[PDB]
């Protein structure tokens, strides 16, 4: 990868970084009981529970309708419905344990239920508010009476209902195809995530990535309408390095020619893996210290001209007519600081001068040595390490791959081309 | 700017306003405190909430090291000195006698946001002595602080990138402390100005430069611009309509806002820029700079304008230009039920123009009112227009016409 | 619309399902009254019962400047609505005068011309439940405690949503939602269809009593007929070992007897219905719809970039897919079923597949979607378009080099 020669046509390629993928499907299950239990209601708070119950129908019924729709030609329609329903049938095998064990929650008040068949595979539950109801109990008994504890309960349940309706956001009746994230249900309780999301089974890797499952989504496989429970297929990853995998980043800072601030367009991220060469879509997936955690293999294919630009045949790099963003004008390359020195007047005060650039040379590097005090607006700064020249500086450069990016401009151009075709050999 | 023709071809120029920019970077540092007061030891639920608040700050403590990071680090390192300075005063002012008290010299302030709900707590206090319970006061206090926690968390739950960018913004912190700060937002900083722009402090962004896990406080460098006009730079703001042709309905697209200056202009983007009674406020001059062809379309050889196919909506019935009416009545048929007729069908036309003097009350699809109607507008001019800028937008359609041209040119270049 | 001839190029089409839209609107005016009047007692009152009032009402009432602009035309739809509200404002104020000091009658059903302004008072049901604490059980000072904190809570819930969505102002009045939202207009149609719908707006406001005035629309559902909504789901198919797909919208429909796209992003699915006021009929290229009409040999294409499972899916039990990115293993007997290079897919049917187990997932057959017949066609790869405009720019710039060097 020609990392260096690009840095006279406006690029920062940061560094290689590794990669990981969630190869397998390590899977435990969760279930919920959305009601809190009281030990004694001697005519205590039950209206608020009825209000919450009545409210929850709106959220819970579309879920049951969709879950009912999930079934294919049954073995007792769309793409991911296939894999979802197959996973539901594979959950039918543990339906036995689930349906045996659902009752122990209603039977007994408790915050988290840890009943499990085996040590490794365990299925657990959480009453929606019981962690706080164990201290809502005391205003009701032996601190105060219930007339206002019921009110406290009402406000608590309303906050919780909005806090669930945000993430199960009923934008559509058939919403179930959209993924509920692990983090809304993480926030379902406030201060039990660092316990259960690390303890649910053997989860060894540190807080940084494996305990940082942003992208992960969650199914729904059992919803009930009489005890008002939810069940969730909680996937879980298991990660290792992937081979020869080098993920770079890509910026594009302008080189202005004849007062035309243009820039090569490129993706956010570019990677390389032996012969593979493509700009992944990694917005969904995490930036780690030295290796990107993405479940899939996001590498794909691009225009041949872009690879030729990266491979080194830079005379095919496409220029682009723009009013650039605020970004592409100047930043630092690991000691070698680059700008566009025709617009911003890079001005070394040591030695004191405006810094000379010809219109021919797009931009020009000034390193640790040629000027310790590389001068721009706010320079009281540090200057240590290498940014290498290494481009046969100066050189002749071509332009013949310029482009326009907005469609209407292309429509204009091709309409001209139509008239020209109708004019050429008519 | 041949508005007398733009009225006749469909394009409109409504509400020309001014422009101003606060290109300056006046900053003052105003921070947080999250642990309010109590008398002889209440602590009735104050321990149930602070480990919880640490559970928030969990994903706020870390840090690590681009033409915006240079800013986000140069400001920070030039002010790391002032941060070290305010460390001492922070230590001094963590404990207080009142909610809202902090003092520094060097006229620039260091006045903190404040112990968050300590206003309402100073209201709450006088019940809790002589009228109420530790139990009831802690009840009130717990429900209040939990409200405040959720109201806080919605602004900023977390670090990880792109939350702080559309997170911590000063107006969202103002929304957080809204009940407290409605009166004194302007006064917290020394600068004073009219309601709209600087007193409003347009949707600015601020970055947390230091955080104290140990004492539950965040160090915020509040940015705070200084405004000044930009003269010989006005706006001729824009909105388009439908326009019939050959009994078919086409249109012409344009931006939502533009700007002119003396001899230059542009369709300036103003999403991050709030509109006002006479002059809107961009933080920096936009550069939505455009074709010579569309420049001519605007302010010259208007026959060089484009023309495109509506599909979504019937944009007419907002056909009101200086009291008059400008709409696509060749197809969206109209009526002057006084001065009675049905409005006619000039087939070359896409928009009639009907004056207040012509029709003393115009009908549309079936309603009848009148605006003023005595304004200022005129028209008598039929026109026939060149057709050499037909375009589209749908990339499929562009590609298909390109492949058609490929077929044609391949025939030709074999021939 | 021609599902049959489209099955052979990856198409799915879920079902015909009509539309049910809003055409009769039945505008209603609602006033919000505040400060729940204590039942006719004395000896209790506070200030933060009132503090928020100036606060919110002063945020709101200066929003009047942007109303006189009567001198996308929802501006004037709004204008006409406000004119009708102006016309009724007389009786609005008369009612408000009647109800204010009446300090009971939480909901009003006068019905002078149309249904009355209900004048939903904030809390008075709970306050009626509350009074018996405040009298014959305790003083009104424990009542002041409870009422202060509850009223503050109700205010905090107001401030969330004050372009309002009507379900939130419903959620203010948790019990009172379904009653009025059901029975204002006599709802003999499905209440649930009505529940889906959501706009609600303020027209003006009082500041001395601090009452908010709203102009609610609450329409009827008239089924349009001879028009059915379709869902669309395309998948891959292969050419020369190049996996290309067919771009199409999320939905299409057949208005009357003509065709066109469909935008039910606005609205909610049903079993035969799609509750959107607007009638999306967005015309698309005649070239495109030539295929949907049946002339398949002039369809567009595109290079694929997606996940895997859009490369296989069901059609009425019998599965359809590319047999190359997912090696078709019918258990008749379980073995790989490769294609001719001519084709891209194979419509595999009730031949021997009793219960297929491709990709490890064992499940059952008995296809019913008929036409167990493949597709021979022209080499019909004509419209090899590209989606992202960049590739088109470089393509035409190569074309520009070509024409410029060849024109000499």
């Amino acid at each position, epitope marked *: 990868i020609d990392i260096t020669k690009l840095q006279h046509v406006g690029v920062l390629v940061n560094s290689p970084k590794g990669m990981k993928i969630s190869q397998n499907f390590e899977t435990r299950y969760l279930i919920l009981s959305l009601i809190p239990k009281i030990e004694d209601s001697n005519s205590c708070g039950d209206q608020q529970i009825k209000q919450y119950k009545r409210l929850l129908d709106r959220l819970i019924i579309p879920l049951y309708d969709g879950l009912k729709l999930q079934k294919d030609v049954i073995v007792t329609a769309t793409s991911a419905q296939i894999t979802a329903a197959v996973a539901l049938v594979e959950a039918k095998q543990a339906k036995s344990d689930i349906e045996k064990l659902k009752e122990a929650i209603r039977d007994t008040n408790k915050a988290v239920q840890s009943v499990c068949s085996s040590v490794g595979n365990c299925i657990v539950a959480i009453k929606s508010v019981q962690d706080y109801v164990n201290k809502e109990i005391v205003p009701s008994i032996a601190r*105060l*009476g219930c007339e206002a504890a019921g009110l406290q309960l009402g406000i608590a349940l309303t906050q919780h209902y909005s806090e669930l309706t945000n993430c199960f956001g009923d934008n559509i009746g058939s919403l179930q195809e959209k993924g509920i994230k692990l983090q809304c249900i993480a926030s379902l309780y406030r201060t039990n995530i660092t316990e259960i999301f690390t303890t649910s089974t053997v989860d060894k890797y540190d807080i940084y990535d494996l305990l940082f499952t942003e992208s992960i989504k969650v199914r729904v496989i059992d919803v009930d309408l009489n005890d008002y429970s939810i069940t969730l297929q909680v996937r879980l990853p298991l990660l290792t390095r992937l081979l020869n995998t080098q993920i770079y980043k890509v910026d594009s800072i302008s080189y202005n020619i004849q007062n035309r601030e243009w820039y090569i367009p490129l993706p956010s991220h570019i990677m390389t893996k032996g012969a593979f060469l493509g700009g992944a879509d990694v917005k969904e997936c995490i930036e780690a210290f030295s290796s990107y955690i993405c479940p899939s293999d996001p590498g794909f294919v691009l225009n041949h001209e872009m690879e030729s630009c990266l491979s080194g045949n830079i005379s095919q790099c496409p220029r682009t007519t723009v009013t650039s963003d605020i970004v592409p004008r100047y930043a630092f390359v690991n000691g070698g600081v680059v700008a566009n020195c025709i617009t911003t007047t890079c001005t070394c005060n040591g030695i004191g001068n405006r810094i000379n650039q010809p219109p021919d040379q797009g931009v020009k590097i000034i390193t640790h040595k040629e000027c310790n005090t590389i001068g721009i607006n706010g320079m009281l700064f540090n200057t240590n390490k290498e940014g290498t020249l290494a481009f046969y500086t100066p050189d002749d450069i071509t332009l013949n791959n310029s482009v326009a990016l907005d469609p209407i401009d292309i429509s204009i151009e091709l309409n001209k081309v139509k008239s020209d075709l109708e004019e050429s050999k008519e | 700017i041949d508005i007398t023709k733009l009225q006749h071809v469909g394009v409109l120029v409504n509400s020309p306003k001014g422009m101003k920019i606060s290109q300056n970077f006046e900053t003052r540092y105003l921070i947080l405190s999250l642990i309010p007061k109590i008398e002889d030891s209440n602590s009735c639920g104050d321990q149930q909430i602070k480990q919880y608040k640490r559970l928030l700050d969990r994903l706020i403590i870390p840090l690590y090291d681009t033409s915006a990071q240079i800013t986000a680090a140069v400001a920070l390192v030039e002010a790391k000195q002032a941060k070290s300075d305010i460390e001492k005063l922070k230590e001094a002012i963590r404990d207080t006698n009142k909610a809202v008290q902090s003092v520094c010299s060097s006229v620039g302030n260091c006045i903190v946001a404040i112990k968050s709900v300590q206003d309402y707590v100073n209201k709450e206090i006088v019940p*809790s002595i002589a009228r109420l319970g530790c139990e009831a006061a802690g009840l009130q206090l717990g429900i209040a602080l939990t409200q405040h926690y959720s109201e806080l968390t919605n602004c900023f739950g977390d670090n990880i990138g792109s939350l702080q960018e559309k997170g911590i913004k000063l107006q969202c912190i103002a929304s957080l402390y809204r009940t407290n700060i409605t009166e004194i937002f302007t006064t917290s900083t020394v600068d004073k100005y009219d309601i709209y722009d600087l007193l409003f402090t347009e949707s600015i962004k601020v970055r947390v430069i230091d955080v104290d896990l140990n004492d539950y406080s965040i160090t915020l460098q509040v940015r705070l611009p200084l405004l000044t006009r930009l003269l010989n730079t006005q706006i001729y703001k824009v909105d388009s309509i439908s326009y019939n042709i050959q009994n078919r309905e086409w249109y012409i697209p344009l931006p939502s806002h533009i700007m002119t200056k003396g001899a230059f202009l542009g369709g300036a983007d103003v999403k991050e820029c709030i509109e006002a009674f006479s002059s809107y406020i961009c933080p920096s001059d936009p550069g939505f700079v455009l074709n010579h062809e569309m420049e001519s379309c605007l302010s010259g050889n208007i026959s060089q304008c484009p023309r495109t196919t509506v599909t979504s909506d019937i944009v007419p019935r907002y056909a009101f230009v200086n009291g008059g009416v400008v709409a696509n009545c060749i197809t969206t048929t109209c009526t002057c039920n006084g001065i009675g007729n049905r409005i006619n069908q000039p087939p070359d036309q896409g928009v009639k123009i009907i004056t207040h003097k012509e029709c003393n009350t115009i009908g549309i699809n079936g309603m009848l009112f009148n605006t003023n109607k005595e304004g200022t507008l005129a028209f008598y001019t039929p026109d026939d227009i060149t057709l050499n800028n037909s375009v589209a937008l749908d990339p499929i359609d562009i590609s298909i016409e390109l492949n058609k041209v490929k077929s044609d040119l391949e025939e030709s270049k074999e021939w | 619309i021609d599902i049959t001839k489209l099955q052979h190029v990856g198409v799915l089409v879920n079902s015909p399902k009509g539309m049910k839209i809003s055409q009769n609107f039945e505008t209603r005016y609602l006033i919000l009254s505040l400060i729940p009047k204590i039942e006719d007692s004395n000896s209790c009152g506070d200030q933060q019962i009132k503090q928020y009032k100036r606060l919110l009402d002063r945020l709101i009432i200066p929003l009047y400047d942007g109303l006189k602009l009567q001198k996308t035309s929802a501006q004037i739809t709004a204008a006409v609505a406000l004119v009708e509200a102006k016309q009724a404002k007389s009786d609005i104020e008369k009612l408000k005068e009647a109800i204010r000091d009446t300090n009971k009658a939480v909901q009003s059903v006068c019905s002078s011309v149309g249904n009355c302004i209900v004048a939903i008072k904030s809390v008075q049901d709970y306050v009626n439940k509350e009074i018996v604490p405040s009298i014959a059980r305790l003083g009104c000072e424990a009542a002041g405690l409870q009422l202060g904190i509850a009223l503050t809570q109700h205010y905090s819930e107001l401030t969330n949503c004050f372009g309002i969505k009507l379900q939130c102002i419903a959620s203010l009045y948790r019990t009172n939602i379904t009653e009025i939202f059901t029975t204002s207009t006599v709802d003999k149609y499905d209440i649930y269809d009505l529940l889906f719908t959501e706009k609600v707006r303020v027209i003006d406001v009082d500041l001395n009593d601090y009452s908010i005035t709203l102009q609610v629309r609450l329409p009827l559902l008239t089924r349009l007929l001879n028009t059915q909504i379709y869902k669309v789901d395309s998948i891959s198919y292969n050419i020369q070992n190049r996996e290309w797909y067919i771009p199409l919208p999320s939905h299409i429909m057949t208005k009357g007897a003509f065709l066109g796209g469909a935008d039910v992003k606005e609205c909610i699915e049903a079993f035969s219905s799609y509750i959107c006021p607007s009638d999306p009929g967005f015309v698309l290229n005649h070239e495109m719809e030539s295929c949907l009409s049946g002339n398949i040999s002039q369809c567009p294409r595109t290079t694929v970039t997606s996940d895997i499972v859009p490369r296989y899916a069901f059609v009425n039990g019998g599965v359809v897919a590319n047999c190359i990115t997912t090696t078709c293993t019918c258990n008749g007997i379980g073995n790989r079923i490769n294609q001719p290079p001519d084709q891209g897919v194979k419509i595999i049917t009730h031949k021997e597949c009793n219960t297929i187990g491709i990709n490890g997932m064992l499940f059952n057959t008995n296809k019913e979607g008929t036409l167990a017949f493949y597709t021979p066609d022209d080499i019909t790869l004509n419209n090899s378009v590209a989606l992202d405009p960049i590739d088109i720019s470089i393509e035409l710039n190569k074309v520009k080099s070509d024409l410029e060097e060849s024109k000499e």
Partner: antibody
Amino acid sequence: VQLQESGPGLVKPSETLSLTCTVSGGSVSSYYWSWIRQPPGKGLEWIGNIYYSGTTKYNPSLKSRVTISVDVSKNQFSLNLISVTAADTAVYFCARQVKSGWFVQPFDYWGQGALVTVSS
Amino acid sequence: QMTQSPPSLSAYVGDRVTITCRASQAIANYLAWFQQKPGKAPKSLIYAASTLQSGVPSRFSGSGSGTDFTLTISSLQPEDFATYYCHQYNTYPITFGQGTRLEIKR
């Protein structure tokens, strides 16, 4: 007004106990009553209240042990508990008190003494 | 929770005599001083710290609020020879104190 107790004064351990208390005057059903006890030596321990609508509220120091009764016609009310140990050798007064503000307080109003002497 | 400053006071007739009950937790809402007299039936005396009951003389009065509270008496007589207590209402279990065995003299 006047309250007045009634019932036996001897109970063998881990048995049931129940004693009655009745007014002589006043007006029932308009407010509460309550029960207070103390050992003969030291202290004073609240047991629980009785409310005329059949509602009771108890000190969780004696949680899930006890029940208090209502009697609107005979104008009385009584106790019924099951874990009658020996360490509860005590006296069992009666309460009749009235509103004040925040929530309402029971105390000694009339009771001469419920002479309890449990034994083995 | 409550307590008692003296467990007894060997106070002879003809002096001011008082008390300092301190609330734990220190808090406002109020305490019903009542006298228990062994040998007869008790009764409640000072509801809400100065509103002494019907018919009790004005000799007793209560002065204070919050963290603690105190008495005010003069013109003593022997018939007030009975163990008093104090109280904490607004922590629902209806607390009391150890006791004040007054002892008149002479």
